[PDB]
């Protein structure tokens, strides 16, 4: 049913479709409904082959990979397939604007994060569309959610939950967010992290918010009467003839359902509270499970190349090593830059293997930190070396000139 609804939405908000475009769109919808929860790469490849078999045996067409299907309504007025390079350029310009406007963060854009942006935008454009992002730390979950919500005009509400906090503060911030969604008709993207669920009662409150479209506990008695009076005054201001309690509360529920999207950020899905959060009954059936996982080696190669291509790196001879194709993760080696990127990727994989992470997702924070440190360190070292060599050279030249002048005299 979610696949059918997605196909209808894409057709309704799309251009004149052909049979090939219809098949590709259905395949993209199948990717977004059936194969965002897959963890392993081999299961993704199996699903790709399954789509190929199903399309070939029912609808007798381009490549149907996960990244080769880029459907987005950002580049036009309608939901249609877009190219890769122009989409990357547009996302680069809009992320530069976002970093200028809200918070500065040095992030580098690759193809997989473009795909994640597209699916997060698709899930945030829906009615009753909630997300649940799973992946290793520093993969870029909350910053992507904030950027996509800024693209759609949503208002970011991040709960300020810390230690020495109880259910009172969480209920207060949830009630405030609900009031902003309904009474002030402001669209809200509430981002809930794994660490913001201190106690299982927080998870129960989130479960009640997601299963229904309101918390019955947060409006009881005198505060229920205050909500009734406030929303009656709002409806009088808006200009609708609602008088009964049932119709007015149904309007309240509909406004919350239309103007509230909850995005979950989860770092390690093996922990007990995270496993309970994943296996929650109405969190599973309502949210769109988007398993980002750890960075695959292509993404690490792309971001490493895009962050070391600006430093002065190639300055000496290089012999191309004779290495296997399975040991080369970048393009075939032509300069020392690809060798440096491959060395960093190999050391990251070997370090995470030696530390026995098991099946826990691998944080790419060490990779980015090492890349930035290497860039700044090689810049400083090259500057110091060339300055020292110039100083020694001019000193030797001055000494030789003085010796020659003394010999001539």
């Amino acid at each position: 049913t979610r696949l059918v609804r997605g196909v209808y939405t894409a057709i309704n908000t799309g251009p004149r479709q052909t049979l090939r475009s219809l098949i590709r769109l259905w395949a993209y919808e199948a990717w977004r409904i059936f194969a965002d929860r897959l963890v392993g790469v081999k299961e993704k490849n199996s699903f790709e082959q399954l789509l190929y078999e199903t399309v070939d045996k029912y609808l007798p067409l381009g490549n149907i990979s996960s990244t080769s299907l880029l459907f987005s309504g950002l580049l036009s007025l309608d939901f249609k397939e877009v190219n890769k390079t122009d989409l990357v350029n547009f996302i680069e310009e809009r992320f530069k604007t976002f970093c200028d406007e809200e918070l500065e963060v040095p992030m580098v854009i690759h193809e997989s994060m473009v795909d994640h942006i597209l699916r997060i935008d698709r899930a945030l454009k829906q009615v009753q569309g909630h997300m649940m992002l799973i992946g290793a730390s520093r993969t870029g979950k909350t910053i992507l959610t904030r950027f996509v919500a800024w693209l759609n005009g949503l208002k970011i509400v991040q709960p300020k939950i810390h230690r020495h906090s109880n259910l009172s503060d969480f209920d207060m911030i949830l009630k405030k967010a609900i009031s902003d969604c309904s009474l002030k008709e402001s669209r809200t993207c509430l981002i809930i992290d794994e660490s913001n669920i201190l106690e299982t009662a927080f998870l129960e409150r989130m479960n009640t918010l997601l299963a229904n479209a309101d918390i019955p506990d947060l409006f009881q008695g005198e505060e229920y009467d205050k909500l009734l009076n406030n929303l009656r005054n709002k409806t009088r201001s808006l200009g609708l003839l609602l008088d009964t309690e049932q119709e007015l509360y149904d309007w309240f529920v509909g406004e919350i359902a239309k103007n509230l999207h909850v995005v979950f950020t989860i770092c390690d899905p093996t922990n007990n509270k995270s496993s309970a959060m994943i296996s929650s009954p109405a969190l599973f059936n309502r949210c769109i499970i988007n398993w980002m996982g750890d960075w695959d080696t292509k993404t690490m190669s792309q971001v490493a190349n895009n962050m070391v291509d600006v430093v002065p790196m190639e300055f000496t001879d290089f012999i191309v090593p004779e290495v296997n194709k399975e040991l080369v993760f970048t393009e075939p080696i032509q300069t020392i830059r690809d060798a440096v990127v491959n060395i960093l990727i190999h050391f990251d994989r070997n370090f995470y293997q030696k530390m026995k992470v098991g099946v826990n997702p691998r944080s790419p924070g060490y990779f980015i930190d090492g890349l930035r440190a290497l860039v700044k360190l090689v810049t400083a070292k090259y500057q110091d070396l060339q300055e020292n060599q110039r100083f020694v050279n001019v000193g030797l030249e001055k000494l030789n000139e003085s010796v020659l002048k003394v010999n001539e005299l």
Partner: protein, 326 residues
Amino acid sequence: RSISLVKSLTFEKERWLNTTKQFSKTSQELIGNCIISSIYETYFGHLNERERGDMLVILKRLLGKFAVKYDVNYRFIDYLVTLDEKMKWLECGLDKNDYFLENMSIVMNSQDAVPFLLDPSSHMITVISNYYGNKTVLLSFLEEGFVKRLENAVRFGSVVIIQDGEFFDPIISRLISREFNHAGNRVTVEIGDHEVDVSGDFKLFIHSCDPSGDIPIFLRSRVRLVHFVTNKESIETRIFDITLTEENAEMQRKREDLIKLNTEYRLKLKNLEKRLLEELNNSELMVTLNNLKKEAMNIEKKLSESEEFFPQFDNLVEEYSIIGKH
């Protein structure tokens, strides 16, 4: 005077020619050395000596597989820890250990990520307190009024060390994650429920004297976790120092004063060489350079005279090696 100027600079000319000859060799191995230095900086903060050596062997193998050159006699202390920084750290109260020197250089060269200190002995708290003087301030996650004290410290610009790191308080997350909003020439950060200004001279340290504690994944993935664990050579050196102080206090005082004078003389010689190079580059001057060369000869003679007490120290070390190993 010009003749003596030319004659006295024979050793300087030989050293300059040797450095010019070795410039190609040092430029060939620059990239590999930078790679290993960055790996030390961002990976081996939380590893013991055996794991550091094993992963260094793996890194050297992986670096030689792709045929990029690196220094065969590479060492982290000689490449990142300068003599002035080493002198300051040793004066402030850091141990003589090479492991502690490596971790010290890792901590104070992390200008981007917030360094997390894991020191069971609680010695780095007073080492960093001595390093920054009276402008440092000590807070903790377990005390009331921590939020307003940290906000006032950020507004003023003091250096903050937060104790009890295993009790992380998640309203300083924007301070940990370095997610600032730039407002022209002023930088502001949102802590709690109201934004505060950042003076730009404010540095953050997190200290936790509890090994095998609990570091949240948000905090664990964004800090330079540095472990200060005592090892074999630190125990041997401390045992030798304690037994020599309790055995012959005057001789121990003489040896430590001699070591301090020797390293001060080496630093003065390096600064004198740098000043001579700068003065010759910016070309009266002959008399000044003759005075500098006389000072350098005096320093070299002072080292030659001061190098006559080493065999006694070596004999005492060879005598107390059994006590140290026991």
